Structure formats: C-alpha cells, structure tokens
C-alpha cells in the first residue's frame, strides 16, 4: 500500500469481495458458493459454472449461520484461494451484515483465529463502512441486496441495532417469482441454464421507469418497453411489460408474495421509530445503498420515494453515488489506510488474555 | 462582544421577534450605523449639560436641573466611561415629555474646518 | 536627457491656454464641456508633480527616476494637445466637434489609455447636445440659444406670411445645418428634421409634448440605444398627427367635397 497494509474481506450473500486495503477496486471478486459435490474443493467462477454437480449455499443468509462447516469453508476459500496471503504479514478486517448478534461475532473471530492464526484482526459492521465512504458520521442507509435488506439508522458512527429494521429480501426469491410467472405465461423452465439467462436479463435488460402507472398503461396498450434480444445461444425471449411488473414488491409487497412490508413503507415506519431530534440529522445526509444499482435507473425512483416520505419545505441533501455495491469494500479501503483506525484494531494479546468477547467491544 | 453582533442584540431588545424573522430592519440599521460609526466631530460635555438644563427648563422643572449637576459631577468623579459626551447626547435625544427649534441655537464644531 | 522630456511640457502648455479660452460663451456650448473634462488629468498631474517634489527633498527622487515614472503621462497628455490642436486647426463648434471626437474615438484602440481618454471625453461632450435633443425630439420648437444644433428653426408661419404664400411649410421653415450634423446621426437625420415638424402642429391646436419614451439620451461608443429612442419617438409623432388630422379637420370630408 502506502504504509503497513491490511486485508479487507467483504463476506456477503450475493458475492464475496476480497483484496488488500488501499485498493479502490477489489483485488478479487468471486461469487458466494461452497465446494464439495452434491470441484473437489473449490470456490469461484469454476464452482459457479459447475453448479449442477455441486451445492450452492450462502455462509450468511440473512445474518444467521446455517452450518459451521459452510461458514468456515467459504471463509477458508476466501483467505487461502481467493487471495493467497500470509496471515502474519497482513491482518484481516471482517464484516457482518447490519443487526447481527454478538455471539456470531465471537464465533466468527473463533474461526478466524483458529484456522489461520493471525496476530491481529478487525470485525466491523457494513453500514459504518458504507457511511465512511460518504465522509460522514450520521445518516440513514438503506441497504438492499440479493440476500439481505436493512434500513440502518446510524448516528455518531455507531448504528443502533435496536432501531435498525431487518427485512428479508432475496434475489433468489426474485428469480423464483420469475420462474413462476414465466410458467404462468407458458414457457419451458426446468433447468439451470435458463436460470442463468433469466438472471442475466433481469440484471441487464430489465427496465425500471420513474413512474409505475404511466409506463404500465402505455406498455399495456402497445409495448414500447420491449426490445428484441438475440443471444449467441440462439434463443429468443422478450417481454418488456412483465419484467417491469415483477419487482413491484418495492411498493406493494404482496405482488412477490412476501409477508413483510415494502421498502418505502419500511423506511417510513423506521423514520417513525427514529428520534424526533435525530430525524432532521439523519435526513440531512440520506444515502442509497444496496446491490440493486446493478441496473441503474432504479436510483431516480428511489430518490422520488424518499422525497415523498419526508416534507418538501426542508430542502433534501441526499447523497447520490453512481455505484453503491462496493460500499462495504471502499469503506475498509479508506479506513485501514488511516492510523486512527488502528486504535480500534484488535491484537492477539487481548484475544488470548481477555477472551473472544473483547472483539465485540474494541472493534465495531 | 463585537459591535456587529451587538447591533443584532439591539434589534432583539426593542423588537420582541426573532432575528431570523426581522432582518430587513437589521439591514436598514447596519447601513446607518456603518460608515458613520466613530466620532468625527468635536465632543464637548458642557454644552450637552447646558442643553439637558435647557430641556428641563422646557418642562419648567428647576429641581432636577440642579440634581443633574451632582449627577454630572459624579460621572467625572468615577471616570470609567470613555465617551461621556455620547451617553448624555443620547439620553438627551431620547427624552419624553409627560405633561422647539434649533436654527437659532449653536452646536459643536465638526472638524471639517480642521484636518482629520 | 532633458531634451527627451520636453514633449510632455509642450503638451501641457498648449492645453491650459485652451482650457481658459474655450470656456467662454463665444466658443460653443460643447467646447465648454470639453475644456471642463480636460481638468481631471490636471488634477492627477498637479498632485503627482507636487508629491514628487516633496519626495525629492529627501533624495529619494532623481532625474532618471522621474523620466521612468512619467512614461504613461507621456502618452495621455500628448494626445490631448494633439486633440486641442486639431480643434484649433479646423474650427468646429457644437455638432462639428462632435464629429471630430467621433473620429478620434476610432483613431486609437490599442493604446488603451488614449482610447479610454477619448471614450470619457465623448460622453462628456454630448451632455450639452443631447439636452437640446431631449427637447426637440419630444416637443415642437427648439430652445437652442446658439445656432450650432443640427436643426435650425425658421419662420414661415408669421403675421405677414399667409397660407397661400407659404403653401406647405416643407419649403424652407425647417432646415438642417450642413456641418453641425454629428456624422453618426446621418441615417436618421431626415427623420430628426421631420419629427419636431410633426410635433409643433399638434402643439399648435392642442398641447401634446407627451411621448411613450421620455428617456435621457446618452452616448456610448458601439451603442445604438440613441437610435432606438429616436425611432420610437418618430413613430408616435407621425401617428398622433395623422390620427389628429383625419379625425378633427378631416380630409375625408374634404376629399369627397373635391
């Protein structure tokens, strides 16, 4: 780097982002999968290409661990295969999704200190890393990915987990609803390759307009939302209207079949549960986050709903980044370069002398 | 304090309202206090003393006109005010009669005949 | 070295006589305002030469230093003596001088000291002229004390001059002087003559000096606002006279009677 360098590892559920601290892009980006057939032991592009003779599991699915073997295996293939660094010469910063229990943090550092034995570590939350790129210590962050979603109030650089609203949203559920509605429309969908094609067309070809009603009426009378797509496979599927009708669960959640509230209702009831004195302060720097920036154009509609939420006699100061999927990454990238961050960094001595639970207090 | 915030404190004394509400009058005050701020004419407290006497003669009250003399002496006995002329001129200008003209009555020297 | 400096003293000595002389009533009304505008550089000049004299007593000024200091003066005060000599050589009063300055206002650009000097003198000089213009364009008759304005009034409407001895007063009653045209009003000059001509016969029966412009006529180089004001007045003058003539004492009745 520019000083004694560190490691940054973003353990998510859509993808695993790894690399050394002080690099603005991740040095390696792998998808979030476990080995051991349904290669012999591999995580990466090749494991996702051979998904049909392997198993797919996420280590953190919503903020709970499904299997100790699974979490240690995905961490192990991140630290030893995705980067291949020596643990004595680089300390590691680990991450956990917002609203995660303290015992999970203890189990996390218990894996990291036993299977690799580094002399120093850090465990941080994701929202503090997202806000630290935004150069502030205060704001409301709406993270919406493909396996987690939280509207996180963060005040004084410490997210209060009592006021974070947890919302289970997953991109697997999106792809599931896409399969159900393509079968309702009438379409062969029973294998993995068309799942890859359908996730490709929802990430890249799918359109989200600023208004729901106007474009839906116009495309229902004559589809100007359709465009012909001829892949190199030689398959022809298109409809514009239905792929814009599918992610409606943001406004009305009962379209996807979800039981919990929609996204605007979620941040609306969350700001109802924010303190009245801190409301204007959190709104003075409100940020978009989450992986849904994979198709850009969703942002304008997100800002419109946040403007409709709070009053308009207050002039909104909304921080609007172009890219907001590498937020956890760029947080650690800036943070480990500063030497003020090293005073909250935990050594091996406090882990052995004062137990595991000190990583909950010294790192945050 | 500094004078610039002190004029605001005056704008908050006489008007009850907040200073974010009334700012047109504070703007009108800042023009007139500025650029005519410091003394530029000759100060003399004795003429102002005799004019406080002439105001109290205009009420036909001769007792407080003799009380003013010992108060005017006490102002010089202590001597902790930089401009004795200003506050007596000020208080004389702000008089109110419970119950004339000044083109026959001669004022102070301007230091426009004298070099600044 | 002392010979090198004498042009600036020569270009002072031929202006200060001018400033006194052309400030009297005989020398125009614009030569007045011109000689008064060459006072502002004498102010600069006087205080510089005074303070440089007081600086010299300490030994902080010398001859070479003085020569180096007075270089921008050597341009600006030379140009004014050249201007005064050109005014003296062909004697111009009023509008004719206002052509001469208009020549001077293009004869230098790249100096940028001998441009701004003339650019200030030009706006100074057409303050007396454009206040005769502020009456003649909005009213019927001149109040010119001299005869150096571009229009000159005559009388063919008199006690002893009948209506069949003057026919129409387009004959000689309103004329334009030859060289008192300011030489940039040439395109409007005929309309300038026609305007107060329209206005006086509506003052003759009514009172109408009213206009929708009523704006102070000013000068700037490469400005044509003092064109548009004249055009806007010229429209309303002929409009009011034509509308008055065909309504009261109409030609509609008289033509059918012919």
């Amino acid at each position: 780097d520019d000083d004694i360098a560190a490691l940054v590892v973003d353990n998510g559920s859509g993808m695993c982002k790894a690399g050394f601290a002080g690099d603005d892009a991740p040095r390696a980006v792998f998808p979030s999968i476990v080995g051991r057939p349904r290669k012999d032991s591999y995580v990466g592009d090749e494991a996702q290409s051979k998904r049909g003779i392997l198993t797919l599991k996420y280590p953190i699915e919503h903020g709970i661990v499904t299997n100790w073997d699974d979490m240690e295996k995905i961490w192990h293939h991140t630290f030893y295969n995705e980067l291949r660094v020596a643990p004595e010469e680089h300390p590691v910063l680990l991450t956990e999704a917002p609203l995660n229990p303290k015992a999970n943090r203890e189990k996390m550092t218990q894996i990291m200190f036993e299977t690799f034995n580094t002399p120093a570590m850090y465990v941080a939350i994701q929202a503090v890393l997202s806000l630290y790129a935004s150069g502030r210590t205060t704001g409301i962050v709406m993270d919406s990915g493909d396996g987690v979603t939280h509207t996180v109030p963060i005040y004084e650089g410490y997210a209060l987990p009592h006021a974070i609203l947890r919302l289970d949203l997953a991109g697997r559920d999106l792809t599931d609803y896409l399969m159900k509605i393509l079968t309702e429309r009438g379409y062969s969908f029973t294998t993995t390759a068309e799942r890859e094609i359908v996730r490709d067309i929802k990430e890249k070809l799918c359109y989200v307009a600023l208004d729901f009603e106007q474009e839906m009426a116009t495309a229902a009378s004559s589809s100007s939302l359709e465009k012909s797509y001829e892949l190199p496979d030689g398959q022809v599927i298109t409809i514009g209207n239905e792929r814009f009708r599918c992610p409606e669960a943001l406004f009305q959640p009962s379209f996807l079949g979800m039981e919990s509230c929609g996204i605007h209702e979620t941040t609306f009831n969350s700001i109802m549960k924010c303190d009245v004195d801190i409301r204007k302060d959190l709104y003075a720097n409100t940020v978009l986050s989450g992986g849904t920036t994979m198709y850009p154009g969703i942002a304008d509609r997100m800002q419109k709903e946040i403007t409709a939420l709070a009053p308009s006699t207050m002039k909104i100061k909304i921080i609007a980044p172009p890219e907001r999927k590498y937020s956890v990454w760029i947080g650690g990238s800036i943070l480990a370069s500063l030497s003020t961050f090293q005073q909250m960094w935990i050594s091996k001595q406090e882990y052995d002398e004062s137990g595991p639970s000190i990583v909950h207090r010294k790192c945050f | 304090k500094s004078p610039n915030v002190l004029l605001q404190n005056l704008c908050c004394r006489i008007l009850g309202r907040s200073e974010a509400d009334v700012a047109q009058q504070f703007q009108y005050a800042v023009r007139v206090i500025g650029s005519n701020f410091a003394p530029t004419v000759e100060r003399d407290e004795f003429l102002v003393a005799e004019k406080i006497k002439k105001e109290l003669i205009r009420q036909r009250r001769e007792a407080d006109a003799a009380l003013f003399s010992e108060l005017h002496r006490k102002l010089h006995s202590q001597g902790v005010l930089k401009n004795k002329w200003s506050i007596l001129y000020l208080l004389l200008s702000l008089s109110e009669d419970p119950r004339s003209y000044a083109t026959l009555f001669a004022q102070a020297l301007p230091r426009d005949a004298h070099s600044t | 070295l002392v010979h090198r400096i004498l042009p600036v003293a020569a270009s002072y000595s031929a202006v200060t006589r001018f400033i006194e002389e052309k400030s009297s009533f005989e020398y125009g009304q614009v030569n007045h305002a011109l000689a008064a505008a060459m006072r502002t550089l004498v102010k600069e000049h006087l205080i510089l030469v005074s303070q440089l004299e007081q600086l010299h007593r300490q030994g902080l000024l010398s001859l070479q230093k003085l020569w180096f200091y007075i270089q921008p003066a050597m341009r600006t005060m030379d140009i004014l003596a050249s201007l005064a000599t050109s005014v003296d050589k062909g004697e111009c009063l009023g509008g004719s001088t206002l052509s001469l300055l208009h020549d001077r206002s293009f004869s230098y650009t790249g100096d940028s000291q001998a441009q701004e000097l003339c650019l200030y003198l030009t706006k100074a000089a057409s303050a007396p002229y454009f206040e005769v213009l502020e009456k003649w364009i909005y009213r019927g008759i001149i109040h010119d004390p001299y005869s150096e304005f571009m229009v000159e009034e005559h009388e063919l409407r008199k006690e002893r001059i009948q209506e069949d001895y003057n026919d129409k007063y387009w004959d000689q009653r309103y004329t334009i002087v030859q060289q008192q045209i300011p030489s940039f009003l040439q395109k409007m000059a005929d309309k300038i003559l026609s305007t107060g001509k329209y206005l006086n016969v509506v003052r003759e029966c009514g009172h109408d000096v009213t206009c929708p412009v009523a704006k102070e006529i000013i000068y700037t180089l490469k400005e044509r606002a003092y064109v548009e004001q004249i055009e806007k007045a010229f429209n309303y003058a002929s409009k009011v006279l034509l509308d008055f003539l065909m309504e009261e004492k109409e030609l509609v009745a008289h033509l059918r009677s012919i």
């Binding site: - | - | 125009g28 007045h32 305002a33 008064a36 006072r39 006087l46 005074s50 303050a127």
Partner: protein, 61 residues
C-alpha cells in the same frame, strides 16, 4: 504643496463665476436681475450650471 495648488484648482473657477455675475449684474435689483441670472443658466459646463442652478433657486424665493 506646490504652494497649495492642489487645493486651489477648482477654486479660481467657482470664484471666477461668483465674480462674474457680481460684475455683470451692476445696479440691477428687481425683475431685471432675474433677467440677468437666467442668462447664465445657458452655459455648457455643468460646474457653472449646477452653481447658477443653486443661486437661481435662492433668488426665486
């Protein structure tokens, strides 16, 4: 200060005007005097004009 010529330049011009009406108007009183100060509002220098425009405001009271 160059024998005080900084301070006396526009003096000798104002005063020259105030010495001209005081020679031109000799023995005039009454309306024949307001026929002799109204002959000096017909100047072209604004310095004399704004001076006589003040003197004539004084006399017409």
């Amino acid at each position: 200060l160059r024998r005080l010529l900084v301070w006396t330049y526009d003096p000798k011009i104002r005063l020259k005007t105030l010495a001209a009406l005081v020679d031109h108007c000799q023995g005039r009183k009454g309306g024949e005097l307001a026929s002799a100060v109204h002959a000096y509002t017909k100047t072209g220098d604004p310095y004399m004009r704004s001076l006589v425009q003040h003197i004539l405001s004084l006399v017409s009271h």
